[PDB]
Design an enzyme around this catalytic site. Structure first.
Site, short mmCIF file in Angstrom:
data_model
loop_
_atom_site.label_atom_id
_atom_site.label_comp_id
_atom_site.label_asym_id
_atom_site.label_seq_id
_atom_site.Cartn_x
_atom_site.Cartn_y
_atom_site.Cartn_z
N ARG A 15 -1.69 -14.63 4.66
CA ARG A 15 -2.53 -13.87 5.66
C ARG A 15 -1.96 -14.11 6.99
NH1 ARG A 15 -8.57 -15.75 5.43
NH2 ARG A 15 -8.63 -13.78 6.82
N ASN B 243 -1.88 -0.21 7.52
CA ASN B 243 -1.28 -1.30 7.66
C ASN B 243 -0.64 -2.05 6.63
OD1 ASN B 243 -3.27 -2.36 6.09
ND2 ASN B 243 -4.28 -3.49 7.59
N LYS C 96 0.98 -1.20 0.01
CA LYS C 96 -0.14 0.10 -0.01
C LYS C 96 0.79 1.17 -0.09
CE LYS C 96 -3.65 -2.46 2.30
NZ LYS C 96 -4.87 -2.66 3.59
N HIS D 33 -1.94 -5.67 1.58
CA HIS D 33 -2.93 -6.24 1.21
C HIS D 33 -2.61 -7.70 0.84
CE1 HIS D 33 -6.90 -7.45 -0.20
NE2 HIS D 33 -6.41 -8.16 -1.18
N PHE E 165 -17.03 3.18 5.47
CA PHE E 165 -15.84 3.72 5.68
C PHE E 165 -15.21 3.66 4.57
CE2 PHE E 165 -16.42 -0.96 6.06
CZ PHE E 165 -15.54 -1.60 5.31
N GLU F 35 -8.79 -11.08 -7.52
CA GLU F 35 -7.70 -9.72 -7.41
C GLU F 35 -6.42 -9.74 -8.50
OE1 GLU F 35 -6.88 -9.93 -3.13
OE2 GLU F 35 -9.01 -9.25 -2.69
N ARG G 159 2.38 -6.66 10.02
CA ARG G 159 1.80 -5.58 10.64
C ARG G 159 2.17 -5.35 11.99
NH1 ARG G 159 -3.72 -7.60 7.63
NH2 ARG G 159 -3.47 -6.35 5.48
N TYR H 238 -12.18 -3.11 -3.70
CA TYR H 238 -12.94 -3.27 -2.41
C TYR H 238 -14.23 -3.56 -2.79
CZ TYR H 238 -9.00 -1.83 0.12
OH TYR H 238 -7.44 -1.64 0.74
#
Lengths: 149, 149, 149
Positions: free
Chosen positions: A85, A112, A10, A115, A58, A126, A102, A50
């Site tokens: 993950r 964070n 990110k 992704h 949000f 994705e 993280r 998303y």
């Protein structure tokens, strides 16, 4: 059998200049870089990325935070979707386990660093969103005999 | 009150050229190198090392994976048998905790980089199997006052 | 909303020459160094630091271990009191999680490298004991927009 997951650094990962450190963590397990591209994420692509959050209150602020340089990546390995993950840690850095990305780099969920796909279905979706098939590179790691049983 | 454990870098650790990184993780806790030897493991010694798995269907392939260069090691420290096991992580890398050797470096149990004794009895047996008494070196760490309470 | 915690590198951290490594772990999360001072801890200041343990049989030996160079520090961040405790790991290194400072560097509680405040009340007390309020520096991290949500 190996699988492929979508991982994206990110804008905070780019701006804090920890791209190489992130990549090294995945290389260290013998995960193979199958695709990699620097781009600048835009609202239209982020809306699709998303899509599961459409209509949620949000989402506008999330798209704002994510509008910036990103490093799109595909990594290949055994169980790599779930394993990546685990390596990233909880969405909230403050809840993430020591030794995860993280926990080691971050403070708050909205910054964070990274992704990763949360399921086989989202990885397929994705990868197709951010990469054309011709961008996905097939080769064999020379150390495969010592990585895979 | 210290003890000694048998730790062995498997052929994948040698070939992936992470021997120094592995050693550094144990040195970092003030564990003392009491013995170290590079050898090429033979089926004969591996049959005794894996005596607990005699007659199991996976043993022949296990011995084949392990027939190669290995670094035999003895490390000394407080509770080092159990502590080294915790540092290695679960046998299966996918089940191992982030921050452990197996979780940080590996993907599958058949290539999980390192062996460590699982108990006081197995440490004594394994050290005696792989080392002669004259190969075990006794010296004191100069930082002992700052490592031990 | 950020807070501040008191972190102190103990004489074993100084003597084992891992000061920089310790600081880097906190910098890595975007925590701000608000204060930093090298001193030599003395019994009179340590009796106040450990006031809650007055009269306990372990205290004299603890003060002896802690009489030596220390690096006094204040770090600032989101939830940093609790987070720094999590990063240090359990008081007893053998119980600490892999990836924590005490698990990665230490063996026994009496030489566990680092102190961190256990609560907001203790952080206020410890910062006041070890620093003059004037030694606490106010400035803003330039990467704030990528650290904080």
């Amino acid at each position: 059998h190996v699988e492929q997951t979508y991982l994206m650094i990110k804008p905070d990962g780019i701006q804090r200049q920890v791209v190489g450190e992130i990549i090294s963590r995945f290389e260290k397990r013998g995960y193979r870089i199958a695709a990699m591209k620097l781009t600048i994420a835009t609202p239209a692509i982020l809306e699709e990325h998303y899509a599961e959050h459409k209509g949620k209150p949000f989402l506008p602020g999330l798209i704002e935070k994510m509008t910036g340089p990103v490093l799109c990546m595909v990594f290949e390995g055994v169980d790599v979707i779930a394993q990546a993950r685990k390596m990233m840690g909880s969405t909230r850095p403050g809840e993430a386990a020591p030794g995860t990305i993280r926990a080691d780099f971050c403070q708050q969920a909205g910054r964070n660093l990274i992704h990763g796909s949360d399921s086989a279905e989202s990885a397929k979706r994705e990868i197709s969103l951010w990469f054309k098939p011709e961008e996905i590179q097939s080769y064999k790691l020379a150390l495969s005999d010592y990585i895979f049983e």
